[PDB]
Hints:
- The structure is cut from a larger assembly and holds chains A, B, C, D and E.
- Chain A is 0% helix and 53% strand.
- Chain A has 2 domains: 1-120, no CATH class; 121-219, Immunoglobulins (Immunoglobulin-like), CATH 2.60.40.10.
- Chain A is elongated.
- Chain A has strands spanning 3-7, 11-12, 18-25, 33-40, 46-51, 57-59, 67-72, 77-82, 91-101, 104-110, 114-118, 127-131, 143-152, 158-161, 170-178, 181-190, 201-206, 211-216.
- In chain A, strands 2, 4, 5, 6, 9, 10 and 11 form a 7-stranded mixed β-sheet that branches. A 4-stranded antiparallel β-sheet of chain A has the order 1-3-8-7, with no helix packed on it. In chain A, strands 12-13-16-15 form a 4-stranded antiparallel β-sheet, with no helix packed on it.
- The termini of chain A are far apart.
- Chain D contains 1 helix and 4 strands, in the order H-E-E-E-E.
- Chain D has one helix at residues 2-11; strands spanning 32-44, 49-59, 79-81, 107-109.
- Chain D has a two-stranded antiparallel sheet with strand order 1-2. Chain D has a two-stranded antiparallel ribbon with strand order 3-4.
- Chain D is elongated and about 60 Å long.
- Chain E is mostly beta strands.
- Chain E has 1 helix and 6 strands.
- Chain E has one helix at 3-12, and strands at residues 32-44, 49-61, 77-80, 108-111, 115-118, 121-127.
- The radius of gyration of chain E is 19 Å and the shape is elongated.
- Chains in contact: A-B, A-D, B-D, C-D, D-E.
- The interface between A and B is large, with 46 and 54 residues.
- Residues 141, 143 of chain E line the site of a molecule of 4 linked components (NAG-NAG-BMA-MAN).
- The PDB classes it as membrane protein.
Amino acid sequence: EVQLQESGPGLVQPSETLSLTCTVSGFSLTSYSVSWLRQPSGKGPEWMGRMWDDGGTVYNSGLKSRLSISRDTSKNQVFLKMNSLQTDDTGTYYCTRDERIRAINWFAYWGQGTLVTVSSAETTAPSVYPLAPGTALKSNSMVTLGCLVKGYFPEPVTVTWNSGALSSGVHTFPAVLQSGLYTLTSSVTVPSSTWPSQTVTCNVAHPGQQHQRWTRKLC
Amino acid sequence: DIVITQSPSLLSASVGDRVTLTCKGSQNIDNYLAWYQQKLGEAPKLLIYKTNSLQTGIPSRFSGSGSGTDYTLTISSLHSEDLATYYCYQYINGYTFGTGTKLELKRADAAPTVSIFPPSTEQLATGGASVVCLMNNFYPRDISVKWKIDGTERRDGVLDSVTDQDSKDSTYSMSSTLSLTKADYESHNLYTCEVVHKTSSSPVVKSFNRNE
Amino acid sequence: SEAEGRLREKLFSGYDSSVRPAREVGDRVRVSVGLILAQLISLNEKDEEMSTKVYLDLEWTDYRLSWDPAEHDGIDSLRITAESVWLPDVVLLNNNDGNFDVALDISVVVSSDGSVRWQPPGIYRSSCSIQVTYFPFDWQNCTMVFSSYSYDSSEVSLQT
Amino acid sequence: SEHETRLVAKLFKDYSSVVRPVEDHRQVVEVTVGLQLIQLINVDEVNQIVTTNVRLKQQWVDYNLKWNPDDYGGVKKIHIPSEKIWRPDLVLYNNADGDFAIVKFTKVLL
Amino acid sequence: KNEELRLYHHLFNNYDPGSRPVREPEDTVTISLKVTLTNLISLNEKEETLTTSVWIGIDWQDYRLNYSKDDFGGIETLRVPSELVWLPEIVLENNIDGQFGVAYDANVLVYEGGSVTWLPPAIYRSVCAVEVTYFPFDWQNCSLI
Ligand SMILES: *[C@@H]1O[C@H](CO)[C@@H](O[C@@H]2O[C@H](CO)[C@@H](O[C@@H]3O[C@H](CO[C@H]4O[C@H](CO)[C@@H](O)[C@H](O)[C@@H]4O)[C@@H](O)[C@H](O)[C@@H]3O)[C@H](O)[C@H]2NC(C)=O)[C@H](O)[C@H]1NC(C)=O
Ligand SMILES: *[C@@H]1O[C@H](CO)[C@@H](O[C@@H]2O[C@H](CO)[C@@H](O)[C@H](O)[C@H]2NC(C)=O)[C@H](O)[C@H]1NC(C)=O
């Protein structure tokens, strides 16, 4: 019944302003308070502020100057606005319905959360370098070979092996930021005799600029 | 505000086990502590509030206990659906959250499939020389990796990431990289990847000499 | 007087007379305490008690009671019964008979800038240490000690 | 103070001054009682009555009147009318011709 | 949750202190009276006023306030403000200062089984005609009605 859905921009530049809309259904904002939480990357969540059912607002004292919250009771929407943005603000932002007992409040339902990334970097296509072992040192029934997906921005990047022929023998290790851009790795398991002769190829695409590449395995 | 810590940081348990997660404050939390469950890409769900009030519609296998500055969440019968990260939080003085306990199904030990790849000449043509080393389908996630170049250890430019539990075998896969310039790469010839894991008293090593 | 009723209803919509008009949580309320002596009723040496009839002169700013007079038909000041606005609990601490409060809760005057002025009459019987020595040529130094009973110096700042 | 007004409104929305301010009825309300003597107004030897000016500092915890300060801008204390809340019914057992109980219901520091 | 709040709501959500605790109008409410004298404050012969401090023990059955401790967590007594329950309005008729009622409106005690107890403290000034004939060896037949 009770549902909340955050929405907003996935990327924002530093010192710009962020706006998020918490859509609400299954209850009326006039009778339930809505709090905003954020989870900074690699940190526990923190409480940012609350839209009271009576329409008042309260903010985390560390963010009070940076924050404003407003609502539209006809649309059942709660709006978060933040300025003076910085890279530390990158994280998942949640809006929550707050339960109460007397004056005590706690978060009872969470929204699905919107990932906000604060970065000035422009969208960039990935390079797809081939990865092959330095020597076929053993006739293993399968050998791991991979592709390096480096230099792209923003997330996500999609990687496949011979399109639909990737099979479950593929891993997509999480991307890592370096120098303001992402790098990702993937690998496939293939027979030691197959990969030097068959065109075993990784297929990589990037929705940020509709980029596409394919790189075979060679040594 | 009341600082909160959780233990264990990562816990592995088999389906049907009784497990308890401990949450400890820096001050008397006065039973105003709550527990919620989070899953990757899913909205967090409140399990318990006021340290023992079960949230409506939550399975009764979840139960809470504690007083003063120590609190525990108990799952009396771990289902496969209960594998998630659990955060305690406090709402009597500010709002502080624990670091979260990640709960995974216990898995039989597996040695990492270690492999190493030189920077291909297609990469070297661009002047990039990032080396990469992989360790697939190992368990437990406890692993340590060191880069050595011409026998000399390297730490600058080292990066790594680890996948979650595989949806079919619950093992972990790890990638590691060593970004280098073409000049820095060509300055050396021996490269090796050293991986330490609990399944062996000595590290696994994979090496290559010059370009493939 | 339609505009006066509209303004009066606007001011007290959502008002709370039990809550002091601090804007920020750390803000103090400054209350100017004046005293107007209307009659020295008596001095009682047996009880060491001085009876006086006085008018207080309490003035403070209540930001919640501010308004723009040009929006409200030029009403630049308003007279409001004291029970409906927040009042500082200024009381005679050194009273001798237990009558801390004023004798009559007359209406306060509220200015459009939120300045509230209150001049309630009081009948007070303060304790006064009698200088017994030089009777009947004696002179007495009686004191009336006015303070907020409840609010601390960090919440209500009294002033002469 | 909008924060303080909201706090006062939410504390007393469904507060009951009839029942004791315990979490569980088996608990005991523990009241700290300090008599302050302000003035020895009179000693009446003939009537055997002593008139004194006193303050009765009563302190106790109300389980229902807790709040989180960060919900209300950091308000850590408020003053409220004592007629709103439950109070211990301290009575002067040896009252001769005065009031038995308190009659000046000054504000409560909460 | 506090069981006293459940008990209070159960007893008083549909309770009228105006009507007597009788199922039929012609029923008498039996009151048990136990006046406890704390001290004889004074006998003022000049004003013919006896001043006494008393506790007025008043007990009666109110079937509307009946409850069992087993249904409410073992509560055996509930304190309720006397303004909320029906009271017999016992007054000192032969008072002289006009103070008919008690000096403190103490809470009533609603025991399980519907027994209500009230024991307010009262100071009473009452008419006592003084027979001064044998003063100072006199004895006085003061009375409280
Ligand atoms: C202390 O004061 C008490 C109150 O004044 C005294 O008690 C009263 O004493 C008088 C003495 O004359 C009694 O009056 C007599 O009562 C009897 C009994 O009849 C009673 O019942 C009938 C029928 O209901 C009624 O008509 C009467 O009034 C009585 O109530 C009569 O036969 C006599 O004619 C006469 O009226 C009072 O009855 C009595 N009242 C009470 C409540 O005790 C007490 O004697 C004084 N004691 C001392 C030591 O001085
Ligand atoms: C007052 O209430 C009590 C509690 O209900 C009544 O006592 C009996 O309680 C049991 C509960 O187990 C009921 O089944 C009985 O019907 C009750 N009545 C009797 C006569 O046993 C009690 O009767 C009520 N009335 C009075 C006057 O005390």
